[PDB]
């Protein structure tokens, strides 16, 4: 029980590094590199994945 | 009144000098944009500086 809870929590934490089809998995890079009127196409898909 | 190549940059989210510093539309604009050629009536033979 202890190991199965800990592994599930660790896997939940690890999912934050996934890309989900964006150009990068770092939110600050997304908001700084690209333009505001077209950066939302990455933010929404990242939000859906998380 | 706008120079000819600069008509295409009036759209929301688009960048350009008239867009940057004169008149840019909001990102959620709901309306219609209309333009037509006025060389025959606005341009002057020696140049119009008004």
Contact status, residue A39 vs residue A13, Cβ threshold 8 Å:
no
Instruction: Find out whether B4 and B42 touch, Cβ atoms under 8 Å.
Output: no
- Sign of the torsion formed by the C-alpha atoms of A16, A18, A20 and A25: positive
Interface test with A, best of B11, B25, B27, B28 (most A CBs within 10 A): B27
Cβ–Cβ of B27/A37 closer than 8 Å? yes
HEC assignment per residue over chain B: CCCHHHHCCCCCCCCCHHHHHCCCCCCCCCCCCCCCCCHHHHCCCCCCCC
User: Cβ of B11 under 8 Å from any chain A Cβ?
Assistant: no
**Cα separations (Å) of B7 from B1, B4, B23, B37, B50?**
9, 6, 12, 11, 20
Q: By what method was this entry solved? A: cryo-EM
Q: Tell me which residue of B13, A34, A33, A23 sits closest to A46, measured CA to CA.
A: A23
Chain B residues whose CB is inside 8 A of the A40 CB are none
Q: Which residues lie below 8 Å from residue B34, measured CB to CB, with a gap of 6+?
A: none
Burial class of residue B17, CB neighbours in 10 A (0-12, 13-18, 19+): exposed
Instruction: Give how far B14 is from chain A: nearest CA, Å.
Output: 8
Q: How far apart are CA B21 and CA B5, in angstroms?
A: 17
- Neighbour count for residue A42 (Cβ, 10 Å): 19
Contact A40, A34 (CB under 8 A): no
- Which of chain A's residues have a Cβ under 8 Å away from the Cβ of B13? 35-38
């Amino acid at each position: 029980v202890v190991n199965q809870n800990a592994q599930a929590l660790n896997t939940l934490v690890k999912q934050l590094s996934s890309n989900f089809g964006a150009i990068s998995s770092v939110l600050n890079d997304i908001l700084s590199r690209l333009d505001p009127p077209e950066a939302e196409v990455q933010i929404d898909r990242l939000i859906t994945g998380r | 009144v706008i120079r000819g190549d600069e008509v295409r940059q009036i759209a929301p989210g688009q960048t350009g000098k008239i867009a940057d510093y004169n008149y840019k539309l909001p990102d959620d604009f709901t309306g219609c944009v209309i333009a037509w050629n006025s060389n025959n009536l606005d341009s002057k033979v020696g140049g119009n500086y008004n």
